[PDB]
Amino acid sequence: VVANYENASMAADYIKRVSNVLPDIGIICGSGLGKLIEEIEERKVIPYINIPNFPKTTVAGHVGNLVLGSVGGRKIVAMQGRLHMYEGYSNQEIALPIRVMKLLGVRVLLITNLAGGINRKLKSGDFVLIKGHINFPGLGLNNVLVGPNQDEFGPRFPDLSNAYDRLLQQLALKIAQENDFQDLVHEGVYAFNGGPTYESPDESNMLLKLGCDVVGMSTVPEVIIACHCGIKVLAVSLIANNSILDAENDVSINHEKVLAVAEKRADLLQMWFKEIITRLPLD
Amino acid sequence: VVANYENASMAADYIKRVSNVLPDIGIICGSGLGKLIEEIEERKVIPYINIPNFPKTTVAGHVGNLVLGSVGGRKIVAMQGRLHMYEGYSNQEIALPIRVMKLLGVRVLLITNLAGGINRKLKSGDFVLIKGHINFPGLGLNNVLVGPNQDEFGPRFPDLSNAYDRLLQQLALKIAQENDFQDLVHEGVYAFNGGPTYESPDESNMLLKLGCDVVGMSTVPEVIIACHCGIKVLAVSLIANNSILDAENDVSINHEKVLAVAEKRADLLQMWFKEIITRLPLD
Amino acid sequence: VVANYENASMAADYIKRVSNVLPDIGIICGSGLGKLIEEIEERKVIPYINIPNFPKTTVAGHVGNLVLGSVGGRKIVAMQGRLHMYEGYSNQEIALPIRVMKLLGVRVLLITNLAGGINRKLKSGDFVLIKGHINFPGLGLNNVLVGPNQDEFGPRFPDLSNAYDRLLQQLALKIAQENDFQDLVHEGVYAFNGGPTYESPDESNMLLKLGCDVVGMSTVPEVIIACHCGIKVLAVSLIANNSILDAENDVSINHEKVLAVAEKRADLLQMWFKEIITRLPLD
Ligand SMILES: Nc1ccn([C@@H]2O[C@H](CO)[C@@H](O)[C@H]2O)c(=O)n1
Numbered sequence: 001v002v003a004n005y006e007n008a009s010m011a012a013d014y015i016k017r018v019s020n021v022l023p024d025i026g027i028i029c030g031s032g033l034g035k036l037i038e039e040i041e042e043r044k045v046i047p048y049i050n051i052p053n054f055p056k057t058t059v060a061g062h063v064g065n066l067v068l069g070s071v072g073g074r075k076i077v078a079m080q081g082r083l084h085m086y087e088g089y090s091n092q093e094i095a096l097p098i099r100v101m102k103l104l105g106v107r108v109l110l111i112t113n114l115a116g117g118i119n120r121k122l123k124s125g126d127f128v129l130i131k132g133h134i135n136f137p138g139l140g141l142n143n144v145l146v147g148p149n150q151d152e153f154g155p156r157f158p159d160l161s162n163a164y165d166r167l168l169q170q171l172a173l174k175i176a177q178e179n180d181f182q183d184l185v186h187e188g189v190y191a192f193n194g195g196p197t198y199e200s201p202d203e204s205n206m207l208l209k210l211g212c213d214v215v216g217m218s219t220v221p222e223v224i225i226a227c228h229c230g231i232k233v234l235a236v237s238l239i240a241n242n243s244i245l246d247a248e249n250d251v252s253i254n255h256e257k258v259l260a261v262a263e264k265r266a267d268l269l270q271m272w273f274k275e276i277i278t279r280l281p282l283d
Numbered sequence: 284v285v286a287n288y289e290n291a292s293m294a295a296d297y298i299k300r301v302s303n304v305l306p307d308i309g310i311i312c313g314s315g316l317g318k319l320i321e322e323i324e325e326r327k328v329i330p331y332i333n334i335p336n337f338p339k340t341t342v343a344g345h346v347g348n349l350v351l352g353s354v355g356g357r358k359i360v361a362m363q364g365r366l367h368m369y370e371g372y373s374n375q376e377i378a379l380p381i382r383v384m385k386l387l388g389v390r391v392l393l394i395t396n397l398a399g400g401i402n403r404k405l406k407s408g409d410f411v412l413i414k415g416h417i418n419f420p421g422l423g424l425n426n427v428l429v430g431p432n433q434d435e436f437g438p439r440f441p442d443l444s445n446a447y448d449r450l451l452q453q454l455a456l457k458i459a460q461e462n463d464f465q466d467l468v469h470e471g472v473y474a475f476n477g478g479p480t481y482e483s484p485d486e487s488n489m490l491l492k493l494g495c496d497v498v499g500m501s502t503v504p505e506v507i508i509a510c511h512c513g514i515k516v517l518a519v520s521l522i523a524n525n526s527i528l529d530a531e532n533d534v535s536i537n538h539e540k541v542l543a544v545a546e547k548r549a550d551l552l553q554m555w556f557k558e559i560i561t562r563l564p565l566d
Numbered sequence: 567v568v569a570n571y572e573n574a575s576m577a578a579d580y581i582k583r584v585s586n587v588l589p590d591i592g593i594i595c596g597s598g599l600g601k602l603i604e605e606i607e608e609r610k611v612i613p614y615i616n617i618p619n620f621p622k623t624t625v626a627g628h629v630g631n632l633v634l635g636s637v638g639g640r641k642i643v644a645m646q647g648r649l650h651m652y653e654g655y656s657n658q659e660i661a662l663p664i665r666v667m668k669l670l671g672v673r674v675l676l677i678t679n680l681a682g683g684i685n686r687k688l689k690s691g692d693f694v695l696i697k698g699h700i701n702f703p704g705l706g707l708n709n710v711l712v713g714p715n716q717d718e719f720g721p722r723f724p725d726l727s728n729a730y731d732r733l734l735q736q737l738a739l740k741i742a743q744e745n746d747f748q749d750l751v752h753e754g755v756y757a758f759n760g761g762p763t764y765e766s767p768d769e770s771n772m773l774l775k776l777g778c779d780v781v782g783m784s785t786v787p788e789v790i791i792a793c794h795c796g797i798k799v800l801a802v803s804l805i806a807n808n809s810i811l812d813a814e815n816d817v818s819i820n821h822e823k824v825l826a827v828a829e830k831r832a833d834l835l836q837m838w839f840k841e842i843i844t845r846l847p848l849d
């Protein structure tokens with residue numbers, strides 16, 4: 001199913017008729033970082049499988065819902081259960097939910113992920129406000145926009161110079177200073193590793209020489225689709241580990257360790273993004 | 284449709300029977316740089332859609348013709364309307380037109396493109412004679428030759444050490460010196476960004492550290508197919524902007540600016556390539 | 567055909583019923599390096615085309631057998647005729663033979679390949695014990711594990727920190743010292759170039775700046791599938807040429823030169839791996 005104007009309108013048509021919510025903000029949350037979706041007030045849970053033209057996720061299994069309601073006085077829509085391209089989802093399957101957000105009226109998309117640290121300043125449990133990226137799939141002919149362009153959403157050749165909104169980064173840092181956890185907050189450049197294998201020790205060393213601060217398996221596809229159709233983005237990485245240190249010490253990585261870091265910071269991040277949503281200037 | 288010996292012979296069979304032209308030179312021209320195709324003498328325009336086994340381009344739309352005739356006393360064939368891989372065309376769809384050029388008797392292929400400047404010496408409106416490339420899709424398993432090899436056209440493992448003919452670069456520079464615009468002409472290494480998003484500021488910074496002078500979304504696939512079947516290549520980039528400077532100054536890129544640079548240099552480039560065609564030693 | 571638990575069990579079911587061999591070691595040999603497969607004692611040759619669910623190789627042609635028998639008192643299984651991803655084989659087609667090895671009881675996989683030298687210390691005819699890799703397809707969303715995970719074989723997110731067994735590298739070096747050819751043996755990092763074009767001169771120069779010692783078109787996919795399902799790996803590159811030197815001197819590469827180097831070292835490598843198999847501690 002192509003992520004075109006007609007198909008995306010058919011999904012939005014069904015969603016408007018079931019929720020009666022016109023969302024202003026969209027959110028996509030990382031592994032173990034979805035507690036905020038459970039506190040959405042006056043919420044309506046819509047399974048992906050019930051929405052026309054939404055991608056099939058029964059092979060991968062696990063949760064897949066669209067949740068609408070209120071947070072901090074603002075109306076929001078949330079993807080519960082993330083679509084990652086290492087699962088095999090196509091360019092069209094990634095793009096359609098974001099373009100449906102657009103047709104519903106979303107103007108700001110907030111994103112969290114788990115990622116590995118490259119910069120020597122990054123420790124486990126730190127946060128990184130993303131100010132740019134290095135898109136290795138995009139350079140290698142696997143950009144999420146490869147294919148015919150859907151002119152109703154954006155141009156054929158998008159410029160990504162301002163994909164990460166400066167004002168949103170400044171607002172997120174300001175709130176961290178008000179609650180005195182700014183010592184955990186950095187900024188940096190995110191490298192998109194297709195996955196699903198973690199970055200190898202020598203791949204980590206190469207990324208250090210290329211000026212990457214952080215590496216992960218998600219986020220960049222959603223950022224490009226949002227920037228294509230004029231949605232502003234804030235993206236925050238939670239550092240699971242420092243891969244450069246782990247290479248020097250021959251320390252392994254695994255998803256259980258990653259989830260444990262997510263649990264250590266889940267409540268702080270939920271408090272953080274709730275204040276961001278409340279203070280957001282909508283554009 | 285596979286770009287094999289039989290299918291390519293069937294397209295050449297139809298073209299010979301309609302044009303009565305045996306071309307020696309092939310040309311592929313960049314965006315806004317196609318004026319020379321309009322001055323082809325005793326010309327025959329053959330729409331792609333009429334040629335057996337030629338790829339379907341109705342989804343992307345816009346022009347798609349094969350034009351044959353004379354330039355500077357030489358017989359040439361031109362692709363009017365370029366096939367870019369960010370549109371979604373497959374390896375077989377890119378390869379077939381070049382191999383048809385081979386079966387018609389083409390021995391030299393001339394190429395122009397628009398590209399972003401990385402080297403600090405490059406300014407908007409400059410030209411770069413390409414002497415090598417960095418093929419990020421090729422490294423990432425998206426090489427244009429991925430698939431079964433068509434032995435009638437070339438070997439399984441091609442060497443690209445001499446894909447860009449030294450003598451052609453020297454001839455192109457010589458003509459620029461005769462008309463006193465050699466101050467616009469550089470040489471450098473071309474990085475293949477799959478597209479269709481422009482190179483991000485941090486991607487541009489990485490390319491600077493890797494010794495890339497220029498980055499663009501085309502050309503490398505055609506160069507490899509030509510080198511595979513023994514066709515000599517000259518490739519010239521027109522610099523739309525300096526992406527390293529634009530990152531320092533937070534200046535955006537867009538296709539309208541790119542086309543405006545193409546218009547500023549279109550007539551000079553047409554004059555330049557017409558003299559190249561006229562003086563070419565055919566091999 | 568998906569490389570899942572059921573399909574792989576059906577291939578192993580057929581193989582057990584035809585060979586009556588329970589192999590402990592698997593081997594995959596590079597171009598021109600397959601002489602050891604001819605000395606397998608009490609051997610049973612099983613064509614790929616006769617094994618249920620094995621990938622179709624009639625388009626590429628050439629040999630495709632599974633060979634079982636004894637070497638050095640140990641029971642082994644060998645792939646005769648390698649599956650390379652530049653031929654167009656899918657992720658599932660690469661993975662199934664290795665997972666069938668797993669279900670037959672393989673605990674150690676030994677691999678040889680031909681590759682180009684980047685490190686200035688490497689000369690034609692040298693050997694490189696691989697201690698890590700840089701997986702350019704994997705970074706670019708063409709990782710061999712892209713797709714749904716097959717939970718019966720391994721986890722969704724594998725760690726590759728110890729994909730190349732330290733003890734096996736130490737054993738291979740020890741045997742080279744016992745026979746006084748340790749002056750030919752190095753260790754280094756392997757870069758995976760998707761192929762099938764050889765690394766370009768400027769691509770070679772980039773790899774030097776990134777800390778790659780060796781570049782080739784194979785091996786990394788098999789290493790990842792083996793590490794996924796808990797099989798230990800030793801991988802050795804035979805250096806066909808030094809691509810950095812060849813760029814400085816404008817010297818070409820071709821498959822005939824590569825095969826000639828393979829013939830120069832074939833008997834030494836066969837003797838080397840036969841002793842490795844004999845001395846292997848099985849785990
Ligand atoms: N180094 C890492 C570590 C974690 N992750 C993210 O967390 C999950 C896998 O641990 C996956 O959801 C993955 O996106 C990552 O991408 N890269």
Ligand SMILES: Nc1ccn([C@@H]2O[C@H](CO)[C@@H](O)[C@H]2O)c(=O)n1
Pocket residue numbers: 157314396397398399481482498499500501523537538541
């Ligand atoms: N930085 C740039 C700038 C331009 N281009 C080429 O020009 C058109 C898009 O502007 C496209 O046709 C594209 O090939 C490019 O590839 N890279």
Ligand SMILES: Nc1ccn([C@@H]2O[C@H](CO)[C@@H](O)[C@H]2O)c(=O)n1
Pocket residue numbers: 440597679680681682764765781782783784806820821824
């Ligand atoms: N520079 C090189 C040289 C050789 N090879 C390997 O050898 C065969 C092609 O020569 C192919 O089988 C290929 O794997 C390579 O991968 N890279």
